[PDB]
Amino acid sequence: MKVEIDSFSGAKIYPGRGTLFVRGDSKIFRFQNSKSASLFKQRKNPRRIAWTVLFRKHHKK
Template identity: 55%
Template sequence: MVVKTELCSFSGLRIYPGHGIMYVRGDQKSFKFVSRKAKSLFTQRINPRKLSWTVLYRRATKKGTLEDAMKKKARKVTKATVKSVAGASLDIIKAKRNQKPEVRAAAREAALREVKERTKAKQAAKKAEAKKAPAAAKAAPAAKQSKAMAKAGGKAGKAGPGGKR
């Protein structure tokens, strides 16, 4: 047995026989609503696409569509392609790939050792400069004071008790 259902003019929901409200406008156009709530919102001119419970909202925001599930299942698998990198040709990359792991590991260790040696050399140079700098600072006269320091007796910028800062 097939039940003849109608659709709500506002929400798009199904209206079964014996249910719903019929509304006839002054220009003889009739509307069928699933509930008093739908009729009230229609007469207030509320947009059904902005109410999350309506079918129009669900269509506008693509909720509950079966096509999306089908698209997710049948997504294409991307095939990995070998491309050359700027600065290295395809032949060089293939040659490195075909090298034995031991050879690659040894080359990596040698490169790391070289980098560590460079950083140690830089740090040693910095330490040598740091040792030279304090000696030069001690040799310079320590009696250089600003005029404000000399006037205040070495207390420039410090206010006494109750003074403004």
């Protein structure tokens, strides 16, 4: 029973929750919901989405 973290937003991914996504170069993306999954497939930047962990790390929140 491992709690995984969101690749996009840094949220916690509890067991049996959200989707996983294996890219063509075998890089594993685990998403907590369809919201952060859809923002990834829109090629959005996590550092420019205000509620992500990477925003609050870069903006020193």
